[PDB]
């Protein structure tokens with residue numbers, strides 16, 4: 001459970017994300033696929049984007065990153081009270097896309113990397129710690145939902 005002050009730090013940096021959701025999403029996904037190349041294989045439509053410039057020019061990838069960050073932002077704004085928002089995401093990621101928790105850890109690492117890169121003055125130790133706790137909670141709760149659906153990834 002996060003403190004109210006921790007949630008405030010999470011939401012303060014998230015408001016900075018929201019000044020450019022598309023660009024943050026692009027940077028996060030480019031970092032994810034570069035750092036952990038096994039992850040790109042779950043996106044059949046993005047496999048032909050072989051350079052960073054091609055990834056940045058893809059409208060499809062850019063739109064997908066807005067879809068991802070919008071869902072995550074809406075979860076974060078519930079400050080842990082997120083069952084209703086989390087269930088559909090667990091349902092598709094467990095039973096359709098088959099995304100292991102380890103890959104959600106990789107994406108979380110990429111989120112934190114991009115937030116520090118773009119917002120160092122608003123992403124010091126206490127804010128990093130708060131965002132880490134928020135993402136850890138998201139991953140803990142989605143893992144429990146994965147298992148409810150029969151998925152042990």
Ligand code: HEM
Pocket residue numbers: 039040042043067068069071072088089092093097099103104107108
């Ligand atoms: C912060 C974590 C993530 C969030 C919030 C998120 C959110 C979403 C949302 C909202 C969709 C669209 C609706 C749906 O199918 O559920 C989606 C689709 C998808 N996600 Fe995720 N996602 C996350 C992490 C991942 C990771 C780590 C992978 C795999 C490496 C992944 C692979 C996919 C795939 C393959 C699709 C469907 C894409 C398509 O067919 O167009 N997701 N995700």
